[PDB]
Amino acid sequence: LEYSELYPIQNEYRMMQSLDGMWKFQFDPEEIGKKSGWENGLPAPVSMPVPSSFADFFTDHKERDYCGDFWYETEFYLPAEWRNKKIWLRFGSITHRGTVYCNGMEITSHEGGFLPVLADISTVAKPGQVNQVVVKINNELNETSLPCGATKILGRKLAKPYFDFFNYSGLQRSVWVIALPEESVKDYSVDYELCGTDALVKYEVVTTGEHPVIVRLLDAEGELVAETEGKEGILQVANARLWEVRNAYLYQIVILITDGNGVLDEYREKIGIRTVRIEGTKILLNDRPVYLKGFGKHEDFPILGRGFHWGIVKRDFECLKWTNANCFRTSHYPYAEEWYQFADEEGFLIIDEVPAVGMALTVPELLKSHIADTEEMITRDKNHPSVIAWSLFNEPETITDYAYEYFKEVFAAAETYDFQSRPMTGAFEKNSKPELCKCYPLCDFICLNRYYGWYISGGPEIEEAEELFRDEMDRWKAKELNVPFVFTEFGTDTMAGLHKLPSIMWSEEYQKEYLEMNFRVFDSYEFVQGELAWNFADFQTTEGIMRVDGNHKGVFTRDRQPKAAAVVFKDRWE
Amino acid sequence: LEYSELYPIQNEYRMMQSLDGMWKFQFDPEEIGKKSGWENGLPAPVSMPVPSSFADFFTDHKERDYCGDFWYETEFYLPAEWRNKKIWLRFGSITHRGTVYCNGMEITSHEGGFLPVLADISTVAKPGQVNQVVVKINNELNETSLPCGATKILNNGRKLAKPYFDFFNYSGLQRSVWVIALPEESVKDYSVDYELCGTDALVKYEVVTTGEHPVIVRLLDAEGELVAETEGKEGILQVANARLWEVRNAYLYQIVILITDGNGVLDEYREKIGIRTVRIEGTKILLNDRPVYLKGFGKHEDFPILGRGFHWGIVKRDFECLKWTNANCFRTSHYPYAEEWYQFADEEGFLIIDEVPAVGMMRSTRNFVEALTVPELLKSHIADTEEMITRDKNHPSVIAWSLFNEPETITDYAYEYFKEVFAAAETYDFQSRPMTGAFEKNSKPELCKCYPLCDFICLNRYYGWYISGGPEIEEAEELFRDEMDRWKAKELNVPFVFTEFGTDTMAGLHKLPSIMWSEEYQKEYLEMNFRVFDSYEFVQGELAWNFADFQTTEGIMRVDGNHKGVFTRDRQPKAAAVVFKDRWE
């Protein structure tokens, strides 16, 4: 990559300053901003919180549903001391695609709305002065970038997703301006081997120069436990304190660039010594089988939309721990980096998912976008101990040799980017029948999204649903694939407060009964090794006749309170 | 018909005793009742309220969702003084079809779940003794009777109803049951038709009796004073300075029909009627020689726990809510209601579009959920039409017959089918009042072959809900105007009434800006629809879908039934109710 994905830190060599706050903001329905000098400042802005999705602040439909080009602007004072450092704007994300300007100059553009955007403003930055950043953003959906959809023209544009979740957009994550030394740590990778009571931390370091590198490992108390020299090497850890499920331990890696007797740069990050591998039908963490228990989530909260906030992280993890979960999938896009940092702390397992949802010649361009997002996700997230698997798709077509050749390239790219070569998978929709699917052989383990008892034979037909479920799982069993299966979606829309005896679809009681039936099926097959329910919480969707204020398959409400079924998960996962 | 549809009364010649209460009840999944002698008494019954739908009492799915044969039983004491009378069991309805037994003997069978079933028990009744009634009922759905659907058989043999319609398959004995006694020669039927002559009015009539003795017909005013009298089974009553029955301003005369043998009276039937005329003239609906614009709702017979079970309390609350909205009309979507609804409409001056249960004839939903069944369906359809019209014709409230809801109408075959239904309706209605049906959007103005059969056209349209909802609502309005412009350009010179339009609306779901399903969106949707309605001269009525939230088959598109109610199921107003109130004032 032409930039670093490394999370920004502050020390003797690296500086950072937050640009979060109220930005200037303006819609550009006529698409004349770049024609009209907007990159030098917006002509008639309103204020817009950053980080946040813009949609749910407004009281009018056309602003909430805005689709097209729209602009952000802010000003920041740059400390004079940042002079002659490499100065970067770092956006947690820009959703979905955008062009960054600084002091009237075009800096960079990015496609993909859920991963960091880095813009090198070294040559245009004005140390000791007020600087200006302007971002042109677009939130349309197409079939050549992720996530896929269409754009309808009423000249007013309307996003038409091929995915369920609401098309939130804007500057949904924190924005920093940072300063790095001229020769810096750009990237590093760690991989682990367990040796009795000891451990090896294998590493590679990429810098922007040719000076020597020293790598140190500190324990949780900051004590030096290992040290070595070189951009490539092994850190030997005696009596290693392994990072364990729901029982984290984090070391601190310290990467130094040196020039004789002085340090040029120093990067530090918390990491966790752990191994993950698929062995037969088992998922092994540190050589012991683990059964995944948890949820698909979303970045979704009232008013903020996908806007990041530590308070949402904290509540969600307390709820997760209360259910006795150990895992979540980042459905259906990489989350803010902070979610992974916290999962590292709390010992949660993550399946990290690229926004390959909603899946013509456009396909070669789509593949490029999909591979680019995969590269960025893996480079960003590989050193989190929590991240134990990559999900490279959600419910694509998989039953043609055409689909096979496409995903072969994606998986091949993912493999080259992940230093750890940790398990890769994808979530299969029901149409990927065991007799037809061509893509499951690409996977280290198989993830199934199934709604037997909701979309199939729901309600009075739920007994039929269970037989149909068992019939499919019997077909999978007969294949003797010798791989683990994880259910990554299953659930029922459930309106909090809707009670019925006997239960009906949409009642709290039916949600319980549906889950109990699914558990019976899960527990009937030895090779099922994980259950991640859909969804952790009710979340916003495109409005329509099938969505009663978003998706109500949450086990929790949108404001994070338990429906009756939450207790069912709690008791089972205990 | 081989029986009378006349509502039962109590007088010197006619007797009635209610059989309402707790009956015995037993499911018959193995279909062994008849060969096991259940007509002589159920072997292991539970208690079941009558009138009520049975489904919602139970706490287990299989009993609520039961589909197939099931049996009712009760016992009653017959007064000795009823001997030498004609003795009938009268069920307000039996849903959907059944066979009536009395004292172990098969009496009659009936197909059609929403109209009276009369069983002549004269030859087996035991006056001065306890008698037994047992009813075998079936609630399956098929394509040869109304309303249409399918029956699914689960692998273990259990049946499940699969409607082609969007209302829960409630069934059982949902209306009151009487045992009655009639004179051996009785009034079996009568018909009235009205003509206005300045300040006066003519009541033309026909009387059918079960004998040959002379008939005398009297008309009493609302104070019981005689205003007209004539003789003969056919004749004309002249009413000077007639007090007409008016919209939301009812006046009811009492017709008195006597059978005499000179020596004395053999029978005397009495019913309240209202002098009023209804006709279509160009694009106008004329009541009593003046245009009326229909304002109201499609309803249902639907209430918590009782299901479609009849209760006067539901009538009273519903009419108070209707009056509060300033409504003047409802459609009996999608089946004839209990007779009491019409009696009360007569009193309150409400206009009714009386609808036969011809629902579920849509090819699309049939396929989703034929040459040989259609001829049998037509027979059932015409039979239900005959029974509805014979039952309801003399209500002043009933101003129109709706003969279908959302059938296929774009083939020549559909035209020939409905031509026979409309022809039948015409012959059974002494008044020849306006006939119509409600059309789905698939019945495009360029394709529909059946609207020329109608005296006025009823449209069900969901522009802004099923079509271009929410962010696309502006487009919905354009599409709506586009269609109505096409109708306009046909210059049919007939009235159009919208018989369905609405949005599912969860009580308490608020959003700013609004979203589909919110209370605010229901308001905005209605306002948009009104703007379109008001753009066309030939639109002469608006009956919103629905008066109140109601039960449906469960599924992914129904959140505890249908929420397009303007009122909640327990009859309280959503925000949109005030929108109707203010507009209709």
Side-chain angles (χ1 to χ4, degrees), chain A residues 61 64 152 156 160 460-461 464 467 500 503 505-506 543-544 547 549, chain B residues 61 64 152 155 158 162 471-472 475 511 513-517 554-555 560:
Chain A
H61 304 270
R64 174 198 69 193
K152 178 170 179 173
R156 185 163 76 96
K160 304 291 274 184
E461 295 182 354
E464 168 177 271
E467 306 167 69
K500 209 72 78 173
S503 73
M505 294 171 65
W506 287 90
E543 58 188 282
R547 291 289 179 260
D549 193 16
Chain B
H61 299 102
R64 176 198 69 192
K152 177 176 180 171
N155 301 92
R158 184 161 74 100
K162 302 292 250 181
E472 301 182 322
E475 170 180 81
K511 226 92 177 175
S514 75
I515 56 163
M516 297 172 64
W517 285 91
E554 56 187 289
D560 193 16

mmCIF file of all heavy atoms in Angstrom, chain A residues 61 64 152 156 160 460-461 464 467 500 503 505-506 543-544 547 549, chain B residues 61 64 152 155 158 162 471-472 475 511 513-517 554-555 560:
data_model
loop_
_atom_site.group_PDB
_atom_site.id
_atom_site.type_symbol
_atom_site.label_atom_id
_atom_site.label_comp_id
_atom_site.label_asym_id
_atom_site.label_seq_id
_atom_site.Cartn_x
_atom_site.Cartn_y
_atom_site.Cartn_z
ATOM 1 N N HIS A 61 -37.292 14.340 4.952
ATOM 2 C CA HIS A 61 -36.931 13.116 4.247
ATOM 3 C C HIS A 61 -35.768 13.296 3.281
ATOM 4 O O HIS A 61 -34.907 12.435 3.187
ATOM 5 C CB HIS A 61 -38.115 12.562 3.447
ATOM 6 C CG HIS A 61 -39.346 12.313 4.257
ATOM 7 N ND1 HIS A 61 -39.605 11.104 4.871
ATOM 8 C CD2 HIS A 61 -40.410 13.107 4.525
ATOM 9 C CE1 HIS A 61 -40.766 11.173 5.497
ATOM 10 N NE2 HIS A 61 -41.277 12.375 5.300
ATOM 11 N N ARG A 64 -32.363 13.233 5.033
ATOM 12 C CA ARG A 64 -32.070 11.887 5.548
ATOM 13 C C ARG A 64 -31.720 10.908 4.432
ATOM 14 O O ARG A 64 -30.769 10.131 4.548
ATOM 15 C CB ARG A 64 -33.262 11.342 6.339
ATOM 16 C CG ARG A 64 -33.081 9.894 6.774
ATOM 17 C CD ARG A 64 -34.431 9.275 7.148
ATOM 18 N NE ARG A 64 -35.265 9.099 5.952
ATOM 19 C CZ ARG A 64 -36.566 8.826 5.980
ATOM 20 N NH1 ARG A 64 -37.200 8.702 7.152
ATOM 21 N NH2 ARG A 64 -37.232 8.670 4.838
ATOM 22 N N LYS A 152 -31.180 4.926 -7.930
ATOM 23 C CA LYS A 152 -32.373 5.278 -8.702
ATOM 24 C C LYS A 152 -32.491 6.784 -8.845
ATOM 25 O O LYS A 152 -32.197 7.531 -7.915
ATOM 26 C CB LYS A 152 -33.632 4.712 -8.038
ATOM 27 C CG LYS A 152 -34.957 5.065 -8.746
ATOM 28 C CD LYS A 152 -36.095 4.256 -8.135
ATOM 29 C CE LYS A 152 -37.447 4.574 -8.771
ATOM 30 N NZ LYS A 152 -38.478 3.635 -8.241
ATOM 31 N N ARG A 156 -33.567 13.789 -8.390
ATOM 32 C CA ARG A 156 -33.183 13.369 -7.044
ATOM 33 C C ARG A 156 -32.762 11.902 -7.023
ATOM 34 O O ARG A 156 -33.471 11.040 -7.535
ATOM 35 C CB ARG A 156 -34.331 13.607 -6.061
ATOM 36 C CG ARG A 156 -33.954 13.315 -4.616
ATOM 37 C CD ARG A 156 -34.948 13.937 -3.649
ATOM 38 N NE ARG A 156 -36.191 13.183 -3.580
ATOM 39 C CZ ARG A 156 -36.451 12.265 -2.651
ATOM 40 N NH1 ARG A 156 -35.552 11.986 -1.708
ATOM 41 N NH2 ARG A 156 -37.610 11.625 -2.667
ATOM 42 N N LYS A 160 -30.454 2.343 -3.694
ATOM 43 C CA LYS A 160 -31.220 1.097 -3.688
ATOM 44 C C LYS A 160 -30.282 -0.067 -3.381
ATOM 45 O O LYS A 160 -29.772 -0.721 -4.291
ATOM 46 C CB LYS A 160 -31.923 0.881 -5.036
ATOM 47 C CG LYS A 160 -32.836 2.031 -5.443
ATOM 48 C CD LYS A 160 -34.074 2.129 -4.562
ATOM 49 C CE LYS A 160 -35.196 1.240 -5.066
ATOM 50 N NZ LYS A 160 -36.441 1.425 -4.258
ATOM 51 N N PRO A 460 -46.733 -21.899 12.062
ATOM 52 C CA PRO A 460 -47.424 -23.190 12.193
ATOM 53 C C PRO A 460 -46.655 -24.317 11.507
ATOM 54 O O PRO A 460 -46.885 -25.490 11.823
ATOM 55 C CB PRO A 460 -48.774 -22.950 11.500
ATOM 56 C CG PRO A 460 -48.915 -21.449 11.414
ATOM 57 C CD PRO A 460 -47.519 -20.927 11.282
ATOM 58 N N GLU A 461 -45.753 -23.963 10.591
ATOM 59 C CA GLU A 461 -44.964 -24.960 9.860
ATOM 60 C C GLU A 461 -43.583 -25.203 10.467
ATOM 61 O O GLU A 461 -42.724 -25.819 9.828
ATOM 62 C CB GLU A 461 -44.800 -24.542 8.400
ATOM 63 C CG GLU A 461 -46.105 -24.499 7.616
ATOM 64 C CD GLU A 461 -45.894 -24.119 6.163
ATOM 65 O OE1 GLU A 461 -44.752 -23.774 5.793
ATOM 66 O OE2 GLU A 461 -46.866 -24.163 5.389
ATOM 67 N N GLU A 464 -42.152 -28.660 10.276
ATOM 68 C CA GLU A 464 -41.659 -28.892 8.927
ATOM 69 C C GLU A 464 -40.301 -28.217 8.729
ATOM 70 O O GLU A 464 -39.410 -28.768 8.083
ATOM 71 C CB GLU A 464 -42.674 -28.380 7.909
ATOM 72 C CG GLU A 464 -42.164 -28.293 6.488
ATOM 73 C CD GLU A 464 -43.244 -27.849 5.525
ATOM 74 O OE1 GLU A 464 -43.960 -28.727 4.994
ATOM 75 O OE2 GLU A 464 -43.380 -26.624 5.306
ATOM 76 N N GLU A 467 -37.500 -30.322 10.052
ATOM 77 C CA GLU A 467 -37.164 -31.457 9.195
ATOM 78 C C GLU A 467 -36.399 -31.017 7.995
ATOM 79 O O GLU A 467 -35.510 -31.669 7.583
ATOM 80 C CB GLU A 467 -38.353 -32.219 8.623
ATOM 81 C CG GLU A 467 -39.415 -32.750 9.507
ATOM 82 C CD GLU A 467 -40.650 -33.181 8.674
ATOM 83 O OE1 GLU A 467 -40.542 -34.177 7.930
ATOM 84 O OE2 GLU A 467 -41.714 -32.520 8.739
ATOM 85 N N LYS A 500 -47.544 -13.417 22.837
ATOM 86 C CA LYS A 500 -48.686 -14.194 22.401
ATOM 87 C C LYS A 500 -48.581 -15.628 22.897
ATOM 88 O O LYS A 500 -47.488 -16.213 22.932
ATOM 89 C CB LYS A 500 -48.807 -14.160 20.873
ATOM 90 C CG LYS A 500 -50.226 -14.305 20.362
ATOM 91 C CD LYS A 500 -51.068 -13.062 20.612
ATOM 92 C CE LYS A 500 -50.761 -11.960 19.604
ATOM 93 N NZ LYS A 500 -51.712 -10.793 19.729
ATOM 94 N N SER A 503 -47.498 -18.754 20.749
ATOM 95 C CA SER A 503 -46.664 -17.779 20.069
ATOM 96 C C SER A 503 -47.053 -17.584 18.608
ATOM 97 O O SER A 503 -47.591 -18.483 17.949
ATOM 98 C CB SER A 503 -45.202 -18.211 20.135
ATOM 99 O OG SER A 503 -45.017 -19.317 19.257
ATOM 100 N N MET A 505 -45.187 -15.789 14.896
ATOM 101 C CA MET A 505 -44.053 -15.095 14.295
ATOM 102 C C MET A 505 -44.150 -13.616 14.647
ATOM 103 O O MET A 505 -45.240 -13.037 14.554
ATOM 104 C CB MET A 505 -44.041 -15.293 12.780
ATOM 105 C CG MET A 505 -43.789 -16.749 12.404
ATOM 106 S SD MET A 505 -44.016 -17.043 10.631
ATOM 107 C CE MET A 505 -42.691 -16.061 9.952
ATOM 108 N N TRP A 506 -43.012 -13.049 15.057
ATOM 109 C CA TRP A 506 -42.831 -11.657 15.517
ATOM 110 C C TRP A 506 -42.980 -11.480 17.033
ATOM 111 O O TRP A 506 -42.589 -10.440 17.559
ATOM 112 C CB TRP A 506 -43.787 -10.691 14.805
ATOM 113 C CG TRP A 506 -43.410 -10.423 13.377
ATOM 114 C CD1 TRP A 506 -43.818 -11.122 12.276
ATOM 115 C CD2 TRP A 506 -42.564 -9.370 12.894
ATOM 116 N NE1 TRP A 506 -43.266 -10.576 11.141
ATOM 117 C CE2 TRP A 506 -42.502 -9.497 11.490
ATOM 118 C CE3 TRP A 506 -41.854 -8.336 13.513
ATOM 119 C CZ2 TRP A 506 -41.758 -8.628 10.697
ATOM 120 C CZ3 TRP A 506 -41.119 -7.462 12.711
ATOM 121 C CH2 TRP A 506 -41.082 -7.620 11.327
ATOM 122 N N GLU A 543 -36.226 1.505 4.558
ATOM 123 C CA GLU A 543 -37.615 1.301 4.952
ATOM 124 C C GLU A 543 -38.331 0.513 3.859
ATOM 125 O O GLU A 543 -37.886 0.470 2.713
ATOM 126 C CB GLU A 543 -38.329 2.630 5.261
ATOM 127 C CG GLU A 543 -38.364 3.644 4.164
ATOM 128 C CD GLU A 543 -38.918 4.982 4.644
ATOM 129 O OE1 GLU A 543 -40.156 5.102 4.784
ATOM 130 O OE2 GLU A 543 -38.116 5.911 4.858
ATOM 131 N N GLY A 544 -39.410 -0.161 4.230
ATOM 132 C CA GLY A 544 -40.178 -0.929 3.269
ATOM 133 C C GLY A 544 -41.262 -1.712 3.974
ATOM 134 O O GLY A 544 -41.412 -1.623 5.191
ATOM 135 N N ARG A 547 -40.027 -4.186 6.828
ATOM 136 C CA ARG A 547 -39.162 -3.672 7.883
ATOM 137 C C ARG A 547 -39.890 -2.653 8.772
ATOM 138 O O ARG A 547 -40.178 -1.520 8.366
ATOM 139 C CB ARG A 547 -37.889 -3.084 7.253
ATOM 140 C CG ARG A 547 -36.966 -4.144 6.619
ATOM 141 C CD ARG A 547 -36.277 -5.008 7.703
ATOM 142 N NE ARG A 547 -35.395 -6.065 7.185
ATOM 143 C CZ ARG A 547 -35.732 -7.353 7.083
ATOM 144 N NH1 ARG A 547 -36.951 -7.770 7.429
ATOM 145 N NH2 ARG A 547 -34.854 -8.231 6.621
ATOM 146 N N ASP A 549 -39.542 -0.290 11.200
ATOM 147 C CA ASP A 549 -38.438 0.493 11.759
ATOM 148 C C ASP A 549 -37.195 -0.378 11.880
ATOM 149 O O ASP A 549 -36.765 -0.736 12.985
ATOM 150 C CB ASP A 549 -38.786 1.105 13.121
ATOM 151 C CG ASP A 549 -37.774 2.166 13.554
ATOM 152 O OD1 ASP A 549 -36.997 2.636 12.700
ATOM 153 O OD2 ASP A 549 -37.748 2.531 14.744
ATOM 154 N N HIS B 61 -50.471 -24.198 19.867
ATOM 155 C CA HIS B 61 -50.543 -23.891 18.433
ATOM 156 C C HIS B 61 -51.509 -24.798 17.686
ATOM 157 O O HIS B 61 -52.266 -24.337 16.832
ATOM 158 C CB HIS B 61 -49.156 -24.008 17.776
ATOM 159 C CG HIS B 61 -48.128 -23.067 18.323
ATOM 160 N ND1 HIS B 61 -47.152 -23.463 19.214
ATOM 161 C CD2 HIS B 61 -47.880 -21.762 18.054
ATOM 162 C CE1 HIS B 61 -46.366 -22.436 19.493
ATOM 163 N NE2 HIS B 61 -46.783 -21.395 18.792
ATOM 164 N N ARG B 64 -55.144 -23.855 18.090
ATOM 165 C CA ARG B 64 -55.429 -22.573 17.431
ATOM 166 C C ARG B 64 -55.479 -22.717 15.909
ATOM 167 O O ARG B 64 -56.368 -22.187 15.242
ATOM 168 C CB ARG B 64 -54.368 -21.538 17.807
ATOM 169 C CG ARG B 64 -54.513 -20.197 17.101
ATOM 170 C CD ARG B 64 -53.207 -19.404 17.179
ATOM 171 N NE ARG B 64 -52.151 -20.015 16.360
ATOM 172 C CZ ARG B 64 -50.861 -19.689 16.413
ATOM 173 N NH1 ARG B 64 -50.434 -18.757 17.261
ATOM 174 N NH2 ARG B 64 -49.986 -20.305 15.621
ATOM 175 N N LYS B 152 -53.063 -27.443 3.248
ATOM 176 C CA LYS B 152 -51.771 -28.117 3.191
ATOM 177 C C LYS B 152 -51.761 -29.272 4.170
ATOM 178 O O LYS B 152 -52.237 -29.152 5.295
ATOM 179 C CB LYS B 152 -50.631 -27.147 3.501
ATOM 180 C CG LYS B 152 -49.253 -27.807 3.519
ATOM 181 C CD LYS B 152 -48.164 -26.779 3.744
ATOM 182 C CE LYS B 152 -46.786 -27.438 3.770
ATOM 183 N NZ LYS B 152 -45.697 -26.425 3.766
ATOM 184 N N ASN B 155 -46.456 -33.514 6.954
ATOM 185 C CA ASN B 155 -46.020 -34.902 6.780
ATOM 186 C C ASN B 155 -46.700 -35.884 7.729
ATOM 187 O O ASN B 155 -46.923 -37.043 7.378
ATOM 188 C CB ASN B 155 -44.502 -35.002 6.944
ATOM 189 C CG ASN B 155 -43.755 -34.132 5.956
ATOM 190 O OD1 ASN B 155 -43.430 -32.981 6.250
ATOM 191 N ND2 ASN B 155 -43.485 -34.673 4.772
ATOM 192 N N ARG B 158 -51.274 -33.766 9.697
ATOM 193 C CA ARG B 158 -51.953 -32.578 10.211
ATOM 194 C C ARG B 158 -52.276 -31.602 9.080
ATOM 195 O O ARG B 158 -51.448 -31.366 8.212
ATOM 196 C CB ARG B 158 -51.094 -31.899 11.276
ATOM 197 C CG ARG B 158 -51.761 -30.704 11.927
ATOM 198 C CD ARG B 158 -51.100 -30.364 13.253
ATOM 199 N NE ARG B 158 -49.805 -29.720 13.067
ATOM 200 C CZ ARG B 158 -49.612 -28.408 13.154
ATOM 201 N NH1 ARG B 158 -50.634 -27.597 13.434
ATOM 202 N NH2 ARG B 158 -48.400 -27.910 12.971
ATOM 203 N N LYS B 162 -54.375 -22.687 4.162
ATOM 204 C CA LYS B 162 -53.530 -21.752 3.423
ATOM 205 C C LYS B 162 -54.408 -20.803 2.620
ATOM 206 O O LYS B 162 -54.717 -21.067 1.462
ATOM 207 C CB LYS B 162 -52.572 -22.501 2.491
ATOM 208 C CG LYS B 162 -51.664 -23.486 3.223
ATOM 209 C CD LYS B 162 -50.657 -22.770 4.104
ATOM 210 C CE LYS B 162 -49.244 -22.900 3.560
ATOM 211 N NZ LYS B 162 -48.247 -22.206 4.436
ATOM 212 N N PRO B 471 -39.495 6.734 0.708
ATOM 213 C CA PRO B 471 -38.729 7.768 -0.003
ATOM 214 C C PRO B 471 -39.235 7.986 -1.430
ATOM 215 O O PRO B 471 -38.965 9.030 -2.034
ATOM 216 C CB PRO B 471 -37.303 7.208 -0.015
ATOM 217 C CG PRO B 471 -37.268 6.194 1.084
ATOM 218 C CD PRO B 471 -38.646 5.608 1.136
ATOM 219 N N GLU B 472 -39.965 7.007 -1.953
ATOM 220 C CA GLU B 472 -40.482 7.082 -3.318
ATOM 221 C C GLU B 472 -41.919 7.602 -3.374
ATOM 222 O O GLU B 472 -42.564 7.513 -4.413
ATOM 223 C CB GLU B 472 -40.399 5.705 -3.986
ATOM 224 C CG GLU B 472 -38.971 5.150 -4.050
ATOM 225 C CD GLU B 472 -38.878 3.805 -4.756
ATOM 226 O OE1 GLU B 472 -39.786 2.967 -4.578
ATOM 227 O OE2 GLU B 472 -37.889 3.579 -5.482
ATOM 228 N N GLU B 475 -42.992 9.646 -6.266
ATOM 229 C CA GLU B 475 -43.158 8.812 -7.448
ATOM 230 C C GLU B 475 -44.501 8.072 -7.378
ATOM 231 O O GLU B 475 -45.187 7.896 -8.393
ATOM 232 C CB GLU B 475 -41.993 7.831 -7.577
ATOM 233 C CG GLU B 475 -42.198 6.763 -8.639
ATOM 234 C CD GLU B 475 -41.031 5.795 -8.748
ATOM 235 O OE1 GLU B 475 -40.956 4.846 -7.932
ATOM 236 O OE2 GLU B 475 -40.197 5.978 -9.662
ATOM 237 N N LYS B 511 -41.651 8.674 14.038
ATOM 238 C CA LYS B 511 -40.370 9.039 13.456
ATOM 239 C C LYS B 511 -40.458 10.373 12.732
ATOM 240 O O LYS B 511 -41.478 10.692 12.101
ATOM 241 C CB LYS B 511 -39.874 7.949 12.506
ATOM 242 C CG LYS B 511 -38.416 7.589 12.689
ATOM 243 C CD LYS B 511 -38.298 6.432 13.664
ATOM 244 C CE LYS B 511 -36.886 5.970 13.833
ATOM 245 N NZ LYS B 511 -36.872 4.917 14.885
ATOM 246 N N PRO B 513 -37.792 12.506 10.207
ATOM 247 C CA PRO B 513 -38.928 12.400 9.291
ATOM 248 C C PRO B 513 -39.561 11.011 9.350
ATOM 249 O O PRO B 513 -38.930 10.072 9.820
ATOM 250 C CB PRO B 513 -38.300 12.654 7.916
ATOM 251 C CG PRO B 513 -36.886 12.173 8.062
ATOM 252 C CD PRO B 513 -36.496 12.439 9.502
ATOM 253 N N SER B 514 -40.788 10.890 8.853
ATOM 254 C CA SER B 514 -41.542 9.639 8.953
ATOM 255 C C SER B 514 -40.898 8.493 8.179
ATOM 256 O O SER B 514 -40.141 8.697 7.212
ATOM 257 C CB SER B 514 -42.970 9.842 8.435
ATOM 258 O OG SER B 514 -42.936 9.917 7.014
ATOM 259 N N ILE B 515 -41.230 7.276 8.596
ATOM 260 C CA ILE B 515 -40.866 6.076 7.867
ATOM 261 C C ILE B 515 -42.120 5.245 7.651
ATOM 262 O O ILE B 515 -43.081 5.338 8.426
ATOM 263 C CB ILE B 515 -39.813 5.217 8.622
ATOM 264 C CG1 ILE B 515 -40.316 4.863 10.024
ATOM 265 C CG2 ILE B 515 -38.479 5.931 8.698
ATOM 266 C CD1 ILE B 515 -39.546 3.708 10.670
ATOM 267 N N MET B 516 -42.124 4.434 6.600
ATOM 268 C CA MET B 516 -43.157 3.417 6.478
ATOM 269 C C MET B 516 -43.273 2.662 7.798
ATOM 270 O O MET B 516 -42.254 2.286 8.371
ATOM 271 C CB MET B 516 -42.839 2.466 5.329
ATOM 272 C CG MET B 516 -42.813 3.180 3.987
ATOM 273 S SD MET B 516 -42.205 2.105 2.661
ATOM 274 C CE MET B 516 -43.476 0.855 2.638
ATOM 275 N N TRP B 517 -44.514 2.492 8.259
ATOM 276 C CA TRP B 517 -44.906 1.819 9.513
ATOM 277 C C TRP B 517 -45.100 2.802 10.673
ATOM 278 O O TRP B 517 -45.710 2.442 11.683
ATOM 279 C CB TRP B 517 -43.900 0.728 9.922
ATOM 280 C CG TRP B 517 -44.007 -0.535 9.092
ATOM 281 C CD1 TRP B 517 -43.330 -0.818 7.939
ATOM 282 C CD2 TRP B 517 -44.840 -1.673 9.363
ATOM 283 N NE1 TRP B 517 -43.698 -2.067 7.474
ATOM 284 C CE2 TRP B 517 -44.617 -2.610 8.329
ATOM 285 C CE3 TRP B 517 -45.753 -1.986 10.374
ATOM 286 C CZ2 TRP B 517 -45.266 -3.845 8.285
ATOM 287 C CZ3 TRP B 517 -46.396 -3.228 10.328
ATOM 288 C CH2 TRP B 517 -46.147 -4.131 9.289
ATOM 289 N N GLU B 554 -50.260 -15.709 10.252
ATOM 290 C CA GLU B 554 -48.962 -15.172 10.639
ATOM 291 C C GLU B 554 -47.994 -15.381 9.482
ATOM 292 O O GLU B 554 -48.203 -16.249 8.630
ATOM 293 C CB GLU B 554 -48.437 -15.811 11.935
ATOM 294 C CG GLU B 554 -48.326 -17.307 11.912
ATOM 295 C CD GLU B 554 -47.974 -17.878 13.279
ATOM 296 O OE1 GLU B 554 -46.823 -17.696 13.741
ATOM 297 O OE2 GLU B 554 -48.849 -18.533 13.879
ATOM 298 N N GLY B 555 -46.963 -14.550 9.437
ATOM 299 C CA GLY B 555 -45.972 -14.610 8.385
ATOM 300 C C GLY B 555 -44.995 -13.463 8.517
ATOM 301 O O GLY B 555 -45.099 -12.651 9.441
ATOM 302 N N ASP B 560 -48.241 -9.489 14.030
ATOM 303 C CA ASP B 560 -49.489 -9.693 14.766
ATOM 304 C C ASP B 560 -50.648 -9.104 13.972
ATOM 305 O O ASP B 560 -51.273 -8.113 14.378
ATOM 306 C CB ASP B 560 -49.455 -9.087 16.176
ATOM 307 C CG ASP B 560 -50.623 -9.579 17.042
ATOM 308 O OD1 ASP B 560 -51.251 -10.591 16.664
ATOM 309 O OD2 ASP B 560 -50.917 -8.971 18.090
#
